[model samples]
Each structure stands twice: as C-alpha cells, then as structure tokens.
Target: EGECGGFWWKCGSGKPACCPKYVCSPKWGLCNFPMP
Candidate 1:
C-alpha cells in the first residue's frame, strides 16, 4: 500500500514530508478514507 492507502503508510526517503489531515506524521499512517 502507498500513502493514505488505508493500511500501511510512511514518509518519503527525503526531506519535506507532510499531510493535510495530519502534521508531518509519517509514522502514524493514514487509514480513514477508502482506497481508489
């Protein structure tokens, strides 16, 4: 799964990683919306 894939999620291997629903929380992972 990719970012916001409802399962596993993580930040890129580079700098500047962030999310709208969350605040630079790559460890938390997104799992609320359905996967397209």
Candidate 2:
C-alpha cells in the first residue's frame, strides 16, 4: 500500500508516506512534514 499524508498526519505502524517527504515519529506514529 502506497498511501500518502501531510504533517501531523496519523500513520500507524509502518512508516507513513507523506507529501514530498516526511519524518515518521515512532513515539506517536505521526507523519511529520518538515517545513522549508
């Protein structure tokens, strides 16, 4: 499954695929989208 989301997006278990790029937080399984 190749799902995508944005910042602070809820992505449980596996590392979430975010828009452009993302940093998955294991502490909360959150897809953190870094700002430019």
Candidate 3:
C-alpha cells in the first residue's frame, strides 16, 4: 500500500509521499497544493 500524507506532512523523500491530489513542497518537504 501507499502512504497518503495530509497537509503539512513530511514529503520529498524521493518517493510518492503526498496525498492523491496534493503535491509535495520540494523546498520545505511539506505536503501542499500547487497554487499559492
């Protein structure tokens, strides 16, 4: 199974970390949307 990370969740570990619709913030390693 895949780990689905929510908002503010740690990501950018070189794997698919964020949720299905959310994107990972490469600069911060936090799960967030593409738009500001």
Candidate 4:
C-alpha cells in the first residue's frame, strides 16, 4: 500500500479494486509501476 494525498492505496493482482489496469505501485499509490 501507498499514501496518496494522505490516503492509502494499493494495486496489482489484476483486480479492478486494487489494480484495474493490471498495475501495482503501492509506494506512490499508482498502478503500472513497481511497488515499493
């Protein structure tokens, strides 16, 4: 998980909820990137 605008977010697993775009970047709270 990551922090975006003080909010926590997660990605990956190809899940629409975590990663709708099949991406995961929890460090920056973004998808399609390497997670920290």
Using TM-score as the measure, which candidate wins?
3
Q: Note each model's CA RMSD in angstroms.
A: 7.2, 3.5, 2.6, 8.4
How accurate locally is residue 26 in candidate 3, as Cα lDDT from 0 to 100? 69
lDDT of 2 by residue, 1-36 (tens): 556766677777664566667766667777776645
Instruction: Name the TM-score of candidate 4.
Output: 0.22
| Candidate 3 or 1, higher TM-score | 3
Model 4: how far is 35 from its true place, Å?
A: 8.6
lDDT of each: 0.38, 0.67, 0.73, 0.39
Error of 1 at 4 (Å): 9.0
Q: How do the candidates rank by TM-score, highest first?
A: 3, 2, 4, 1
Tens-digit per-residue lDDT, 1-36, candidate 4: 533221234533544343343354555543453333
lDDT tens digits, residue span 2-34, model 1: 344223334445433333443334454333323
Name every residue pair that clashes in candidate 2: none
> In angstroms, how far off is 12's CA in candidate 4?
11
TM-score for each predicted model, relative to the true structure: 0.19, 0.44, 0.54, 0.22
What value does the lDDT take at residue 24 in candidate 1? Answer: 36
Q: Model 3: per-residue lDDT, tens digit, 1-36?
A: 656776676776475667776878868888878776
- Model 3's alpha-carbon lDDT is 0.73
